[PDB]
Design a binder for this molecule. Structure first.
Ligand SMILES: NCc1ccccc1
Ligand SMILES: [Ca+2]
Ligand SMILES: [Cl-]
Ligand SMILES: [Cl-]
Lengths: 250, 58
């Protein structure tokens, strides 16, 4: 995250850290006790699917304070329409091997109904994006969880204000074109969370951009509203042998 | 009332029904109050609420 602030410990309780062989891979969002939403592109280069770990309750990566909960990732589900190395359909649904225990420091973000998300949440101007990604373009990653308030743009306006992948109906733009504030490498997969009448909801996934905090460009986020029914169906399904599962979309 | 305007007055989710009818609903871990619009937690850790801040104003 570029140009944000430290998320006070426990104020981003749905944030997930994904690790491969102990190394930071990506972020994610807890949506109930066994399910995490992340970005498909995070898994393009995974060789051993059995070394993926999700950590909940994380805050300061330099220490252990006892609020952290680590789980093996039992399933990584990606839509059939996602093509590795590209930007469209950038979403993954992860099943944890064992549920996390909800606590003051581990709480799911609400996955909204599609209609609510499209008709109401899509018009809330500002939303929070968070992660332990790079603090600057070409810079070191964060040791404490960072958070940034970003305004959403209608895609027509994003394209007009921007100056290369298309912005599809499965994406939206948010942030700033002055190079000061953006999500960055390492934040991929993390939440774009939107507040409405006292409750927070998952509206986007940190996905891509032209570099990070690039002047003349905005951050691009997976439009989660397009995937609500796909996600809900998969969460009712029984697990299958083998971690990676490609599931038909729609 | 209609769900596309003002969320139909619902705190959370809204369904339009045949006639001038509307039903609000709440996410799991919440129940709908008698006003027909508000949602109140039914569990300790409902989704989308931040415990340390909910306690900070309790
Ligand atoms: N917000 C731009 C971005 C997202 C993910 C990775 C790199 C850049
Ligand atoms: Ca820690
Ligand atoms: Cl099934
Ligand atoms: Cl496997």
């Amino acid at each position: 995250i570029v140009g944000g602030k430290v998320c006070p410990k426990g104020e981003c309780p749905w944030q997930v850290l994904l690790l491969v062989n102990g190394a930071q891979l990506c972020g994610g969002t807890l949506i109930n006790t066994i399910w995490v939403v992340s970005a498909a592109h995070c898994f393009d280069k995974i060789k051993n699917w059995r070394n993926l770990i999700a950590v909940l309750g994380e805050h300061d990566l330099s220490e252990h304070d006892g609020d952290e909960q680590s789980r093996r990732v039992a399933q990584v589900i990606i839509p059939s329409t996602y093509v590795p190395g590209t930007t469209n359909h950038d979403i993954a649904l992860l099943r944890l091997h064992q549920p996390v225990v909800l606590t003051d420091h581990v709480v799911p973000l609400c996955l909204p109904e599609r209609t609510f998300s499209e008709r109401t949440l899509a018009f809330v101007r500002f939303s929070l994006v968070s992660g332990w990604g790079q603090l600057l373009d070409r810079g070191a990653t964060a040791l404490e969880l960072m958070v940034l308030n970003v305004p959403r743009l209608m895609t027509q306006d994003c394209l007009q204000q921007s100056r290369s992948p298309n912005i599809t109906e499965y994406m939206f733009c948010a942030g700033y074109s002055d190079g000061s504030k953006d999500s960055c490498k390492g934040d991929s997969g993390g939440p774009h969370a939107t507040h409405y009448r006292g409750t927070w909801y998952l509206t986007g996934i940190v996905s891509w951009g032209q570099g990070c905090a690039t002047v003349g460009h905005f951050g691009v986020y997976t439009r989660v509203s397009q995937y609500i029914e796909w996600l809900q169906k998969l969460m009712r399904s029984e697990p299958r042998p083998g971690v990676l599962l490609r599931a038909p979309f729609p | 009332l209609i769900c596309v305007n003002e969320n139909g007055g619902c705190e959370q989710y809204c369904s339009d029904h045949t006639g001038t009818k509307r039903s609000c609903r709440c996410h799991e871990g919440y129940s709908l109050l008698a006003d027909g619009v508000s949602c109140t937690p039914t569990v300790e850790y409902p989704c989308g609420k931040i415990p340390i801040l909910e306690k900070r104003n309790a």
